[PDB]
Amino acid sequence: HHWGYGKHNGPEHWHKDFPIAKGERQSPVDIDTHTAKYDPSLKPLSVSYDQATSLRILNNGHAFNVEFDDSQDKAVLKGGPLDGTYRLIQFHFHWGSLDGQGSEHTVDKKKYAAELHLVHWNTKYGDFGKAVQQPDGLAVLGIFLKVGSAKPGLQKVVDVLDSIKTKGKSADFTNFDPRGLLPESLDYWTYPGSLTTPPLLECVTWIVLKEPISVSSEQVLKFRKLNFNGEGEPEELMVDNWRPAQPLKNRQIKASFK
Numbered sequence: 476h477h478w479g480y481g482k483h484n485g486p487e488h489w490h491k492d493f494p495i496a497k498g499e500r501q502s503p504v505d506i507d508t509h510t511a512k513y514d515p516s517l518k519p520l521s522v523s524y525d526q527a528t529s530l531r532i533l534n535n536g537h538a539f540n541v542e543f544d545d546s547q548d549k550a551v552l553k554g555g556p557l558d559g560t561y562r563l564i565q566f567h568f569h570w571g572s573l574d575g576q577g578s579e580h581t582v583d584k585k586k587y588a589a590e591l592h593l594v595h596w597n598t599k600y601g602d603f604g605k606a607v608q609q610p611d612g613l614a615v616l617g618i619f620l621k622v623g624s625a626k627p628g629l630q631k632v633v634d635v636l637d638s639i640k641t642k643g644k645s646a647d648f649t650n651f652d653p654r655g656l657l658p659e660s661l662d663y664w665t666y667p668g669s670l671t672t673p674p675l676l677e678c679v680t681w682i683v684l685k686e687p688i689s690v691s692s693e694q695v696l697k698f699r700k701l702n703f704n705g706e707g708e709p710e711e712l713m714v715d716n717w718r719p720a721q722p723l724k725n726r727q728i729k730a731s732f733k
């Protein structure tokens with residue numbers, strides 16, 4: 476209820492209301508590239524976003540979510556480590572106050588400027604709320620952002636942020652094509668984990684792409700102008716909305732590539 480990313484309500488406090496914060500399959504994690512093992516058993520990853528139907532963008536006080544119509548199999552993720560069909564429901568990002576931090580996952584302890592999460596639920600469970608109660612309910616495709624060249628397919632997102640500055644604001648966001656946020660390669664790492672925000676449910680198969688996308692400094696600067704607060708409340712810039720790496724415990728990270 477009053478969780479956030481500050482000193483007084485941040486990740487080190489979450490366990491009091493959400494004891495699974497100290498569980499056995501929490502996310503994010505550091506991806507040690509030397510220890511991850513290539514797995515021949517992985518099937519090809521299939522990202523099928525041609526019929527994706529975006530609807531709205533919402534500042535929820537923690538990030539902003541671009542939401543999709545998930546009432547039919549329009550935009551789906553299949554293959555890789557996944558059994559069956561996972562429907563896209565929303566994407567969001569986590570980012571930093573500085574270009575050297577912001578990602579949730581790390582790669583050999585490297586932090587990226589931001590991380591995109593494309594969230595999908597397993598259609599065998601009928602709805603998102605049921606899926607999050609299952610160990611294989613969700614698949615989140617995570618994509619790192621580094622600062623360099625602009626990402627043209629992100630600009631429509633950046634340009635609507637002025638209209639959702641504060642918590643609880645939303646705006647129409649139709650006809651956005653999430654294909655424009657992907658890198659060229661679908662090479663990935665995968666492991667079983669959790670939501671990275673309360674309620675921290677252990678329901679996610681994480682698929683983290685190896686290739687980052689590049690976004691411009693100007694693009695990420697606009698993310699940092701958002702607010703965690705509601706309208707008419709003291710301004711708190713929406714920055715550093717990332718959970719740090721958690722203990723790997725009894726898990727193995729698998730690579731799709733040699």
Ligand SMILES: NS(=O)(=O)c1ccc(NC(=O)Nc2ccc(C(F)(F)F)cc2)cc1
Binds near residue numbers: 565592603604670671
């Ligand atoms: N950072 S992360 O990728 O691990 C992650 C964290 C929290 C969530 N939660 C939701 O998407 N919640 C949600 C979606 C959708 C609905 C619906 F509208 F269907 F009720 C109700 C709740 C997802 C992902």
Ligand SMILES: [Zn+2]
Binds near residue numbers: 567568569592671
């Ligand atoms: Zn996330």
